[PDB]
Design a protein around this ligand. Structure first.
Ligand SMILES: [Cl-]
Ligand SMILES: [Cl-]
Ligand SMILES: [Mg+2]
Ligand code: NA
Ligand code: NA
Length: 153
RNA sequence: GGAAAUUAUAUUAAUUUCC
């Protein structure tokens, strides 16, 4: 039905329609490792403070980094149920990384699984080779992406 | 039809805007 270019443009439109973002393989990897740096020890941050922590540190290598773009990455993890959220009446909620997502491998798998879930919600059928290219810019994460698809079905 | 920024406690709702 759709060629690869069409599947890709429709995938990123569906991601952006949920207030989520993928910043590209290198920038997304660094954004997620900064989320881990802030939260792996169980610190409880508001969205404001997590976004500040990650943006200003990305900015030198990735001048495109904004509150908006990094907020959209944090929203992808939020939609993925990666955070334990503490509500505070008439105040900002605090967020902690659930214990099972306090390594890069586990957090990155949950992140990837959520983008595949968005593809499934949007009716976009994308093969593991295209997923590896989209999320990693290489063909060395095909088996990883295949595993994620099969665990979602 | 697509994109960016900005706001918010968002499994999200809007605003503004340079195609
Ligand atoms: Cl498939
Ligand atoms: Cl935007
Ligand atoms: Mg505005
Ligand atoms: Na939104
Ligand atoms: Na969450």
């Amino acid at each position: 039905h759709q060629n690869p270019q069409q599947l890709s443009s429709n995938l990123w439109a569906a991601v952006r329609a949920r207030g989520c973002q993928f910043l590209g393989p290198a920038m997304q990897e660094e954004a997620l490792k900064l989320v881990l740096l802030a939260l792996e020890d169980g610190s409880a941050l508001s969205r404001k403070v997590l976004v500040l922590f990650v943006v200003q540190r990305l900015e030198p290598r990735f001048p495109q980094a904004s509150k908006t773009s990094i907020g959209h990455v944090v929203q992808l993890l939020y939609r993925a149920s990666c955070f334990k959220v503490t509500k505070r009446d008439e105040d900002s909620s605090l967020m902690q990384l659930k214990e099972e997502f306090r390594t890069y491998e586990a957090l990155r798998r949950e992140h990837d699984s959520q983008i595949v879930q968005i593809a499934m919600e949007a009716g976009l059928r994308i093969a593991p080779d295209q997923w590896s290219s989209l999320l990693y810019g290489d063909q060395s994460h095909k088996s990883h992406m295949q595993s994620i698809i099969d665990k979602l079905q």
